[PDB]
Amino acid sequence: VQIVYKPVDLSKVTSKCGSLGNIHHKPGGGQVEVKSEKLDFKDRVQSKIGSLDNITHVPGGGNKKIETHKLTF
Amino acid sequence: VQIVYKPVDLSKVTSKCGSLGNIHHKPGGGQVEVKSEKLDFKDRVQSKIGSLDNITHVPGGGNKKIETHKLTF
Amino acid sequence: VQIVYKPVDLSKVTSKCGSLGNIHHKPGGGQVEVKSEKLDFKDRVQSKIGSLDNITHVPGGGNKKIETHKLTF
Amino acid sequence: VQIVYKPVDLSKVTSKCGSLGNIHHKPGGGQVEVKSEKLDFKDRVQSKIGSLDNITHVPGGGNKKIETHKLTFR
Amino acid sequence: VQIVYKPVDLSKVTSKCGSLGNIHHKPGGGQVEVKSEKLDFKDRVQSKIGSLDNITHVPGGGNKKIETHKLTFR
Amino acid sequence: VQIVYKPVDLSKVTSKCGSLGNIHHKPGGGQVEVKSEKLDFKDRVQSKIGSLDNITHVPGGGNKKIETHKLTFR
Amino acid sequence: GSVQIVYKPVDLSKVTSKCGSLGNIHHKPGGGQVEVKSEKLDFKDRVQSKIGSLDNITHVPGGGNKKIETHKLTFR
Amino acid sequence: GSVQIVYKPVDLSKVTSKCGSLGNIHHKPGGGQVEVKSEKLDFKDRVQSKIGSLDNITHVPGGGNKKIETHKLTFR
Amino acid sequence: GSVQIVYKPVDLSKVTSKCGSLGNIHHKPGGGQVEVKSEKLDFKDRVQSKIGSLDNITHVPGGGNKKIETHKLTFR
Structure with a gap:
């Protein structure tokens, strides 16, 4: 009688999230002009x-890996 | 009697969420004008x-994988 | 009678999240002008x-790895 | 037997290229006014x-004279 | 047997390239005004x-004379 | 046997390249005004x-004269 | 040929006012209000x-008579 | 040929005012108000x-009479 | 040929004002208010x-009479 127990795990479990690898090249400008006699902001x-x-929220993006290995004779 | 428990896992579980790899080349511009005598914002x-x-929210994008390898002889 | 128990684990669990690897090349500029006689901001x-x-919040992005190994004769 | 080899060359081989002998008299005596505002140029x-x-480029204008006066007796 | 090898070259081989002999008299006597405001240039x-x-390039204008006078007797 | 070998070369091989013999009289006697404000340049x-x-480049203008007068007897 | 010009205007004219009195004059306009807006002015030539x-003008001359004479001779 | 000009305008003219009195004149306009708004003014030639x-002007000359004479000879 | 100009304007003209009295003039304008607003100015030629x-101007001359003479002779 013999038992050979050799599970092999080479997995990857990953989360790439939010703003990744983007290029923002020369953004913005021209002219912006707000003109008044009163500006009034009040609630x-x-x-x-x-x-x-540029604004990023990642409440998520979490990983779980669970393994249960058992051998009973 | 010989038992060879040899499972092999080379799998990958991946999550890609939000703004990934985008190119924003010279965004915006022209002329923007807002001319008044009174501007009134109140609620x-x-x-x-x-x-x-540029705004990214990722409440999701989470990743979970679970496995069991029980051998009973 | 013999039992060989040699699980092999070369796996990886990862969280790449928030603002990663982005390129912001010469942002902004132009002319911005805000003219009034009264400015009133109050609540x-x-x-x-x-x-x-540029603002990043990462309340998530956490990892959990669990292995429960048991061998019983 | 008498031989008198006496060729004569009085030629002129000339090249005249580019801006030659021009007269420019009071050019640009005018009035120029540019009054631009609130522009975006994206490129x-x-x-x-x-x-x-005034630009003159002369990659050419080259000149060549080649001649042979070979005399073979007997 | 008598031989008189007496060739003559009085030639002129000439190159005149670029901006030569021009007269520019009072160029740019005018009035220029530029009054730009509130501009964005991205490139x-x-x-x-x-x-x-005034610009002159002369990559050319090159000049060559080649000649051979060989006399072979007998 | 009498041989007279008396070639005569009085020729001239000349190169005149670039800005030569020009007359510039009172150039730029005008009035220039620039009154820029509030500019952004990103490049x-x-x-x-x-x-x-005034710019003059003469990568060319080269000159070459080559000649051979060999007399071979018998 | 010979050119002769005699320019000889003659003037004995009189401009005349008699008045027994000017008075009891009341220039009393209500308060004028003026408001103007334009963004840019650009005046060439x-x-x-x-x-x-x-x-508000109150002009009250005792005479106020005007005599205007223009005499022009042009030759080429 | 010969060119001859005689320019000989003659003037005996009189501008005359009699007035028995100026007075009791009341320039009393109410308070004027002016507002003007712009950004850029550019004036050239x-x-x-x-x-x-x-x-507010109050002009009350005892005479105020005007005589204006313009005399021009132009030759080429 | 000969060019002859005789320029001989003659003038005996008289401007005359008699006024019996100037008086009792009241320039009492209300309070003036002015507000002009701008950001940039340019002036050249x-x-x-x-x-x-x-x-506010109050002008009350006993005469105020104007005689104006312009004489121009131009030759080429």
């Missing part, structure tokens, strides 16, 4: 004038 | 004037 | 004028 | 405003 | 404003 | 304003 | 301009 | 400009 | 300008 206002913005 | 207002915005 | 106001922004 | 720009330009 | 800019420019 | 700029420029 | 002006 | 001017 | 001027 939960968000304003973007001529800005460039 | 949960979101305003974008001539701005460039 | 939870967020204002971006001609600014460049 | 290569070449501009000439009120400029005077 | 290469070449500009000449009111400039006067 | 290479070359600019000439009211400048006078 | 011989432009003469009034923009947004407000004028 | 022979430009004459008035922008946003406010004028 | 023969430009003349007034911007945002406020003027």
Whole structure:
């Protein structure tokens, strides 16, 4: 009687996520012109004038690997 | 009696989520103009004037693989 | 009677997430102009004028690896 | 037996190439006004405003004279 | 037997290449005004404003004379 | 037997290349004004304003004279 | 041939006013209000301009008579 | 040939005013208000400009009479 | 040939004002207000300008009479 138990694992488990490997080449500009006599912002206002913005959230992207190996004679 | 438990795993489990490998070449430009006497924003207002915005959310993109190798003789 | 138990594991578990390997080549510029006589921002106001922004949040991206190995005669 | 080998060359072989003998009198005596505002150029720009330009390239104009005066007696 | 080998070359072989003998009299006597504002350029800019420019290239203009006078007797 | 070998070469092989004998009289006597404001350049700029420029390149203009006068007797 | 010009205008004219009185004159306009907007002005050659002006004038000459004479002779 | 010009205008003219009185004159305009807005002004050749001017004038000459004479001879 | 010009304008003209009295003149304009607004100016050749001027003038000459004479002779 003999038992040979040799599972081989060469796997990869991966998460590539968010903003990866992108090229942003000479973005933006021209002219942006806001003109008034009053600007009035007064509850939960968000304003973007001529800005460039890059924003990334990754709440996810997590990995799990679980293995249970058992040998009972 | 000979038992040769030899499973082999070369698999790959991958996740690719969000903005990956993109090219943004000379984005934007021209002339943007907002001319007034009064600008009035007063409740949960979101305003974008001539701005460039890149925004990525990845709440998902998660990866999980589970395995069991029990041998009972 | 003999038992050979030699599981081989060369696997890898990875999380590449957030802002990785991106190229931002000469962003911004042009002319941004914001002219008034009165500017009035007064409750939870967020204002971006001609600014460049890169912002990354990674609440996720975590890994878990578990192996429970058991041999019983 | 008498031989008088006496050729004569009085020729002129001449080359005249490019901008030769021109008279330019008061060129560009005018008035030039450019009044541009609020422009975006997204690619290569070449501009000439009120400029005077004279270019001469002469890759040619080459000159060659070849001659042989061989005399063989007997 | 008498031989008189008496050839003559009085030639002129000449090259006149490029900008030769020109008169430029008061060029660019004018008025040039450029009044640009609020511009964006994203790639290469070449500009000449009111400039006067004279360029001569002569990669050519080369000159050759070759000649052979061999006399073989008997 | 009498042999007279008296060739005569008074020729001239000449090269006149580039900017020669030109007259420039009061060039650029004008008025140039540039009143730029608020410019953005994101790449290479070359600019000439009211400048006078004279350039002469002569990679050529070369001259060669080759000759042989061999007399062979018997 | 011979050219002869005699230019000999003669003038004995009189411009005349008699007045017994000027008075009790009341220039009392209400308050004028003027508002003007234009972004850019660009004036090339011989432009003469009034923009947004407000004028009150009270002109009360005792005479105010005008005599205007123009005499031109042009020869070539 | 011979060119002869006699330019001999003659003038005995009189501009005359009698007035018995000027007075009791009341220039009382209400308060004027002017507003003008622009960005860029550019003036080149022979430009004459008035922008946003406010004028109150009270002109009361005892005479105020005008005689204007222009005499021109041009020859070529 | 001979060119002869006799330029001989003659003038005996008289400008005359009699006024019995000047008086009791009241220039009482209300408060003027002016606001001109701009960002850039350019001026080059023969430009003349007034911007945002406020003027009150009271002119009360006993005469105020004007006699104006222009004489031009031009030869080529």
